[PDB]
C-alpha cells in the first residue's frame, strides 16, 4: 500500500533548521528560527512557568482526563485576555473557548468545524502569510485564496491593494486576520485601518478569523488586541485562534485556544457542541500541563506580575535589536535605508533581500534566513550583530 | 453563519458522566467511566510518574519545540515495547513512530495519512467497538464497515462469524484489530486465533491497523503484544496506534504513538514524511510533558521497575474484582451464571444486561452503566461490591 507513496515537500520553515545544524561552520547565525532567543542565544523556561510547574507538581492529585474544551479558568482567563475584562461578549456569554494543542491545533479545529458545520468553502489569507496556514485549511478541504497586503517597494501595508483584493470575496467567506505581529512582514493595520476593515467586514458579510499567536509582542498585551476588539465590537460572529507558545515560552507543551463568539448564548452553545464534536474525533481532549501552567500564572497576581515583566523584557529585547540592527547596518556601510525595520512588530521582518542574496548569506557566510528574506530579530544578539551586518552589507 | 447549526448528539461514553455527577443520590456507583479507579475510588498519579515529573522540573532548560514525530527515545522505547527488543522490524529499520496526542490522536493521524496518501476507502471495525472509532475514521472521509465478533448468547468471540464477515472485504481495505482488552467486550482472540487472522490477513491482502490502548492490563506487557507480534511476523506493512493513557495513568497529558511499519527502510521513510505532513497541518508537533515522563520512566531501570509494579498492581486489582464480582453475585442470589466475567480482560465487560435493566439500575439504584451493559470493573471496590451486586440481582 505504501510502495508508491511519494516523498512530501520539505517545509519552508522547518527544513532550513536541518541545513543549519548540519552545515557545521564557525560563527554561523540562524535567523530562520521561529522561536524567541535571548541575549545568550537560548530559549529558556520562563521563571514564572517554572514556578507554576512546582506548584502543580506538589498539588496534582490525578491525571484524569480533561473535558473536550479543557480547563475552565484557562478558558476564562484567555477570554478576558482577548476581549478585555468587562467585555459584553463575556458578560452576555457570547463567546466559548476550547483548549487546543497550540494555535495550529485551534486553526485546524476551526477548519473542521467550519468545513463540516457551515457553508464556508473558502478562506482568504494574506500574501504573504505563515505557510502552514494554506495547509491546515486545505487539509480540512477548504479553498484558500490570497488577498494583497505588503508593498515590496515601500515596505508597508498597502491598504488599497488589500481592500481591493478583498472585493467581491463573497458573503460567507472566511477572511483570516493576523491580530498582531504579522508573520512574516511584521507590518500591521493601524487602529484606523482595523476599524475600516471592521466596517467593511460587516457591510460585505465576511466571517473574520483572528490568528492571534504573539499577543504581547507588539506594543503590550491590551494594545495588541485593539484590533480584535474593534472587530468584536461590530460583529455577531467571530473566531479567534490564539497560542500561548510565544508569550509564555511554552512552545513544546502545545498551548492555545479556539474561541467562538456567536450572536447570543444559545447559539454559541449549539455551535460549540459541534466544535466539541470535531475535537472529540481529532485528539479527544486537550493536554493539561501547559494550559495548567498558563491558568495558574494568569490567576495568581504574584505570578502574573512576574510573567508580565518576563513578557516585557522579551518585547523590549526585540525592540532593542530592531534599533541596533538598522544602526549597526548604517554604520558598516549599508547602502540602503533599512529604517522600516523599526516600524515593524514582534519577532520577524522581511529584510528586503533577494532569493539569491539569501543564498549568498548561507553559502559564503554563516547567515541563515528563510528564502523569503524573513529574518527573526530574536536571533540577533549584540554579540552577533556586527558580523551579521557585515555579511548583509557584503551582498547588498 | 452559525444561526442554524444543529446540536450534535451526546457522546455514548462521555454524556453519562454528567448524568451521574448531577444526580446527587447517596451510595451511587459509576461503572460507566473509562478510567482506572483504585480501592479508595480515585485515579492517582503513579508514583513513578511523579518521580519523573520532579526529574524534569529540575532538568528542563527549554521548552522549545519538538520535531513533528516528537521525542526520539519516546519513539524507540515504544518500538521495543510493541515489537520486543530484538525485533527484525527494529533492526532492519522498517518501523517509524510519531508521538501523537493520545491513542485517539494516533488513530486520527493514521486516518488522514491513509485518506490522503493511499487508496483506502474503508476500514473494518468490530461489532461492537469503542464508539469514537467510527468518528475518527469518518472525520477523515473513510467508510467504516463492521465485522462480527461477539456472541450475546455465549458471551464469547465467535470466530466463525468474525471470519465470514471479513470475507470479500476487498484487498487494500484497512482492518482494525484491538491488540488486547477489547473495549467493550473484554473478549480477545487466542494466540491460535491471532495466528489465523494473521495468515488470512496476507492471503486476502488487508492492511491491519492495531489499536493498542491497554498494553499490560490483560496478562502482562509482552503477552499482550503476542497478537500484534504474530501479525508483524507475517506482514510487510502494518500500522499501530498505542496509548500510554491507561498503563501510565497519564490520561490528561495526551500520550500515544502512531507507528508505521513498511516493507523496508526507504519506504517507511517516504511514507512517514507524508505522515509528518499530516501532523504538521493538524497540531504541528506533539505535547512534550507526558511523553517526557514516559521516556524517562522507560529508560531508567529503577523507575521502570517501580512503574512495572504499579502496572501489575492495577492489573491484579482488576483481576481481583472480576473474581469477587462473580462470587459476590453468586452469593447474593444471582440467578445467572456470570462466570464469563473472569474469562475477559482489562477494565471492561458487557454485563449481559438489557437497556431496560441498565435504566432500572440507574433510576432505582445508584448503579451507572453505559446503555450497552458495559461495566468498568475498575470502578468496583471491595466496599461497593455488595450494594452493587444487590442491585444487579434485583433487576435480573
Ligand atoms: C501566524 C501564526 N499562527 C499560528 C502559529 C502556531 O502556533 P503554535 O506553534 O502555537 O501552534 C504560529 C506559530 N508559528 C504563527 O506564526
Ligand atoms: C480501543 C481504544 N482506542 C483508543 C482509545 C483512546 O486512547 P486515548 O485516551 O489515549 O486517546 C481507547 C480508550 N480511550 C480505546 O479503548
Ligand atoms: O517550528 C514550528 O513548529 C513553527 C514555528 C514557525 O513556523 C514560525 O514561527 O515561523
Ligand atoms: O477518551 C475518553 O475520554 C474516554 C474513553 C472511554 O470512555 C472508554 O474507553 O470507554
UniProtKB/Swiss-Prot annotation, chains A, B:
EC number annotated for this UniProt entry: 2.6.1.1
Keywords: Aminotransferase, Cytoplasm, Pyridoxal phosphate, Transferase
Biotechnology remark: Has been used to construct a 2,4,6-trinitrotoluene (TNT) biosensor strain.
Residues that hold L-aspartate according to the record: 34, 130, 183, 374
Chemical reaction(s) catalysed: L-aspartate + 2-oxoglutarate = oxaloacetate + L-glutamate
Similarity annotation: Belongs to the class-I pyridoxal-phosphate-dependent aminotransferase family.
Effect of residue 374 to F/Y: Second-order rate constants are reduced by >5 orders of magnitude
Documented effect of changing residue 65 to F/S: Slight changes in activity
Lineage, opening ranks: Bacteria, Pseudomonadati, Pseudomonadota, Gammaproteobacteria, Enterobacterales
N6-(pyridoxal phosphate)lysine: modified positions: 246
Compartmental location: Cytoplasm
Gene3D superfamilies found in the cross-reference section: Aspartate Aminotransferase, domain 1, Type I PLP-dependent aspartate aminotransferase-like (Major domain)
EC primary class: transferase
Name the UniProt record assigns to this protein: Aspartate aminotransferase
One GO MF term: identical protein binding
Amino acid at each position: 500500500m505504501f510502495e508508491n507513496i511519494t516523498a512530501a515537500p520539505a517545509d519552508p520553515i522547518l527544513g532550513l533548521a536541518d541545513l543549519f545544524r548540519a552545515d557545521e561552520r564557525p560563527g554561523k547565525i540562524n535567523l530562520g528560527i521561529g522561536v524567541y532567543k535571548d541575549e545568550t542565544g537560548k530559549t529558556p523556561v520562563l521563571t514564572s512557568v517554572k514556578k507554576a510547574e512546582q506548584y502543580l507538581l506538589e498539588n496534582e492529585t490525578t491525571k484524569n482526563y480533561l473535558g473536550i474544551d479543557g480547563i475552565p479558568e484557562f478558558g476564562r482567563c484567555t477570554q478576558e485576555l482577548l476581549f478585555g475584562k468587562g467585555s459584553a461578549l463575556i458578560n452576555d456569554k457570547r463567546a466559548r473557548t476550547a483548549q487546543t494543542p497550540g494555535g495550529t491545533g485551534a486553526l485546524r479545529v476551526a477548519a473542521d468545524f467550519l468545513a463540516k458545520n457551515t457553508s464556508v468553502k473558502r478562506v482568504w489569507v494574506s500574501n504573504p502569510s505563515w505557510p502552514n496556514h494554506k495547509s491546515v485549511f486545505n487539509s480540512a478541504g477548504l479553498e484558500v485564496r490570497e488577498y494583497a497586503y505588503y508593498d515590496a517597494e515601500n515596505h508597508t501595508l498597502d491598504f488599497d491593494a488589500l481592500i481591493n483584493s478583498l472585493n467581491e470575496a463573497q458573503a460567507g467567506d472566511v477572511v483570516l486576520f493576523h491580530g498582531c505581529c504579522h508573520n512574516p512582514t511584521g507590518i500591521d493595520p493601524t487602529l484606523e485601518q482595523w476599524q475600516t476593515l471592521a466596517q467593511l467586514s460587516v457591510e460585505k458579510g465576511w466571517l473574520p478569523l483572528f490568528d492571534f499567536a504573539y499577543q504581547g509582542f507588539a506594543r503590550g498585551l491590551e494594545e495588541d488586541a485593539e484590533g480584535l476588539r474593534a472587530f468584536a465590537a461590530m460583529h455577531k460572529e467571530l473566531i479567534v485562534a490564539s497560542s500561548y507558545s510565544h508569550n509564555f515560552g511554552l512552545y513544546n507543551e502545545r498551548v492555545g485556544a479556539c474561541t467562538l463568539v456567536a450572536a447570543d448564548s444559545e447559539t454559541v452553545d449549539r455551535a460549540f457542541s459541534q466544535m466539541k464534536a470535531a475535537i472529540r474525533a481529532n485528539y479527544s481532549n486537550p493536554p493539561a500541563h501547559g494550559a495548567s501552567v498558563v491558568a495558574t500564572i494568569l490567576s495568581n497576581d504574584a505570578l502574573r506580575a512576574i510573567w508580565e515583566q518576563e513578557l516585557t523584557d522579551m518585547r523590549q529585547r526585540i525592540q532593542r535589536m530592531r534599533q541596533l540592527f538598522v544602526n549597526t547596518l548604517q554604520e558598516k556601510g549599508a547602502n540602503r535605508d533599512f529604517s522600516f525595520i523599526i516600524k515593524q512588530n514582534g519577532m520577524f521582518s522581511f529584510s528586503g533581500l533577494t532569493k539569491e542574496q539569501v543564498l549568498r548569506l548561507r553559502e559564503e557566510f554563516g547567515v541563515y534566513a528563510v528564502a523569503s528574506g524573513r529574518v527573526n530579530v530574536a536571533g540577533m544578539t549584540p554579540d552577533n550583530m556586527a558580523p551579521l551586518c557585515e555579511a548583509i552589507v557584503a551582498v547588498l
